[PDB]
Symmetry: C2
Subunit: 494 residues, 2 copies
């Protein structure tokens, strides 16, 4: 429950809503927030087009995504890939004043979109960024699925070690805890057919990457089939891979509407979460083998991450975006990994269909053009309110969900009762119109950059300071923190 | 054939195209033109949201359309109907400097959209404007299908005479040549079913209009059925009605895809043109009918107008908008009104499918998301290049097609060979971002007001001066004229 206080600038409509009233008046261009305060912010050379966030030490890395389109060839998108496109390196040594220092514009980093990860490991700090658009069949080598691999030993100045070409389009990457392997998901072109897999690259020698292969899922029946995971997270000892999965080649997982549509509704499906035994790779066994340990149907197809709630291991998964009522995270008990169980969900008021209808300017039953000339309601011209990543504060001691909801901003959720997650705060960053990467009315995401903004990045929590890092599309990189009152109340130290 | 000279500012890509190059560089915000020159322009208090153009003497009237949606109740749209929404009255006594002087914000004029017409007749100057969104079932009287009727005898100051409530949604209106009747089309809710008709209002007494009823189409076989005409034009003697028709209740007229769909997908259909005998109403026959004389299949569902090319009677009809290759005018010979024949078509290069494909950033065959997550090519995020009205210079002595192509601007077409219409000029007005009526990214038409503009209005030609009048959504009211060399080539007399 959000208890609104003196510092707060609360939502003026339904929970999760950007009101047309605020859009017309200009109010929507300023931030809305409850339970939090802003520590620092940078618009990253006022560039727009920001997507993913990764980090090493006190450095933030923020990717960009081109307006030309998610799988459009980079070779045809030169008009959209000039500076300031690229992975921005941000100095957060003073979180009051995060400062963009440089731009990484190599084959993988110039248009990384969601494909970027970094990790600090023993003797190794590594940032990788890949061409999200790369490797579509029939294109030239310039448009291949490049992965730029950087030594981030000095996080302010990552050094290109090599550029590897995947033999397929890779959608999202996750570096192993030891920093020696990159796991890259393949969702294209298979998509709903489930004909894809999980690729693994050995980067033990960062200058000589060694491809290990493309893995399907091996079930207790002894059979191996493709799947289309969007992202994976990895257990501390690398023996478990938690995958957010769109579909399985077995046909096991139902597939639904476009996450970027508006009517027809037609729900977007949640997909499935896989718990995968990865011990073969960890122990260097020949012909590995990712074995299905357990499955949570409806677990979330876009991102799944580990959590520990009151000492009980959990996962938080979600689909992404979607026309109202959108998509939202589910809380998954995995105390018995062979039998994961959804025990809770976090929904905003704008994730209830009755509410989507109620706010419409034109009731659907009154629209004679509904089939003949479909026209989205004016309320559908702002941006989806639904998940785009779904992180937690601390995998080892979870209290908070840190949930980007795209146009709904970042939602701060008390997860201490996994069966009943409740919002305790939020931050909607306002608007930043006319940036070079999000302007000119050329967006494809549905986000109205004229009047609002969306947050799409992974979220960091720094336990020693209580700081929370995230990026939003036009408004850039933010450091926020919980109000001291709310923080003390929630069980946090300091 | 466009002959480029000084000081044209020609298109930089295919004929009809707004290049992404020009969008990125900013070039797309400035005008493009050939064969013509700008005489004068007003952005109408910089308001945006402009649609229809009507005129009386040296006055222009320009309507407004709300971002809240074409069919949305006006009572729910207060945030979109404040000034400067309304029918703007523009003084064009000096066409070098047209000036907006007043705003009509009555029930019919506050959100007229396409529903506005004006006529200067003997003893009579009339302007009518109607609530395009009005009369949707299940709504209150505030949201009824109002028609505001103005005495425009002093054209700079139209005086409201009455507000009439039609018993259905009226889509477009056409005042009769004698200024005594208004013909209002009904396309909603029937649309593709063809269940609709043509309504007639007698405005002989402008303060006390009299409803005449709702008419279907009676065929030679004696049977009457509904139709969904979008607009009509009327012969000089009122005895013929030329109707652009979306569908017929008989199922006779193929209906296709959404004109606002980004990407195609199923083709957009052109609809039919009907020639209707309106003698019963004109002569006061009991139980009057509108009798079908001839039909031009694929003639155009949105607008059809009369023309006379080398003394031979024609019609110019078109559908509207549509994903590339859009829609475009067809030239219809009606020498035998019982057997109308399409004899020519005017296409821009952007009305050729192969050209649409050639400019795509991402080929449809390369897109693994084509069905799973449909995303319009970036070239489809600018605005349709397809007809939105399709007028001629002089119905009685036609040389030019004056063809608004929405995002393609206004196209000027030599119609002297009806079998081969060819372009001789064009005007694309640039862009005017951040207007109160078109900004905030809240548009529903597909028009990208950040980088370009769309021209959607009827077009006037003034033979005495050679001036051409049109309105565009954000850039407003324009007066242009033909280069003198172009006039000679076309056979216009000098003036």
């Amino acid at each position: 429950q959000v208890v609104i206080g003196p510092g707060d600038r609360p939502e003026t409509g339904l929970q999760g809503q950007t009101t047309i009233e605020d859009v017309v008046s200009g109010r929507s261009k300023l931030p809305y927030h409850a339970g939090v305060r802003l520590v620092g912010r940078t618009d990253i050379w006022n560039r727009g087009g920001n997507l993913q966030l990764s980090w090493v030490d006190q450095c933030a890395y923020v990717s960009t995504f081109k307006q030309a389109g998610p799988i459009t060839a980079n070779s045809r998108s030169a008009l959209f890939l000039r500076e300031p496109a690229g992975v921005a390196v941000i100095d957060v040594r003073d979180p009051r004043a995060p400062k963009p220092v440089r731009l990484l514009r190599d084959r993988g980093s110039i248009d990384a979109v969601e494909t970027m990860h970094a990790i600090a490991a023993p003797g190794r700090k590594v940032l990788v960024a890949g061409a999200y658009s790369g490797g579509i069949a029939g294109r030239g080598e310039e448009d291949a699925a490049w992965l730029s691999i950087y030594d981030a030993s000095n996080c302010l100045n990552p050094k290109l070690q090599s550029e590897f070409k995947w033999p397929a389009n890779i959608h999202m990457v996750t570096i192993s805890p030891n920093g020696r392997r990159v796991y890259g998901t393949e969702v294209v072109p298979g998509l709903g057919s489930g004909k894809g897999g999980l690729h693994v690259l050995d980067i033990s020698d960062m200058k000589r990457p060694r491809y290990l292969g493309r893995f399907g899922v091996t079930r207790p029946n002894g059979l191996t089939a493709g799947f289309t995971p969007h992202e994976v997270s990895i257990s501390h000892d690398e023996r478990r891979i938690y995958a957010a999965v769109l579909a399985s080649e077995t046909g096991d997982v139902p597939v639904g509407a476009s996450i970027l549509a508006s009517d027809g509704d037609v729900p977007v499906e949640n997909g499935s979460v896989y718990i995968l035994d990865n011990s073969d790779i960890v122990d260097g066994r020949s012909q590995p083998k990712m074995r299905l340990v357990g499955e949570a149907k409806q677990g979330g197809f876009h991102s799944v991450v580990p959590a520990s709630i009151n000492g009980v291991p959990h996962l938080v998964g979600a689909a992404e975006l979607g026309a109202c009522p959108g998509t939202w995270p589910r809380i998954i008990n995995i105390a018995d990994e062979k039998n994961p169980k959804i025990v809770g969900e976090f929904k905003l008021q704008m994730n209830i269909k009755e509410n989507c209808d109620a706010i419409r300017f034109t009731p659907r039953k009154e629209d004679p053009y509904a089939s003949f000339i479909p026209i989205p309601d004016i309320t559908a011209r702002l941006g989806a309110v639904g998940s785009h990543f779904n992180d937690v504060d601390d995998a080892r001691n979870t209290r908070l969900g840190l949930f980007p909801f795209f146009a709904g901003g970042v939602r701060i959720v008390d997860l201490r009762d996994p069966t009943k997650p409740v919002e305790v705060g939020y931050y909607k960053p306002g608007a930043n119109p006319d940036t070079p990467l999000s302007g000119n009315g050329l967006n494809w995401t549905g986000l109205n950059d004229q009047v609002t903004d969306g947050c799409m990045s992974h979220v960091r929590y720094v336990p020693e300071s209580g700081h929370i890092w995230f990026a939003c599309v036009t408004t850039g990189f933010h450091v926020v923190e919980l109000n001291p009152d709310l923080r003390a109340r929630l069980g946090f130290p300091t």
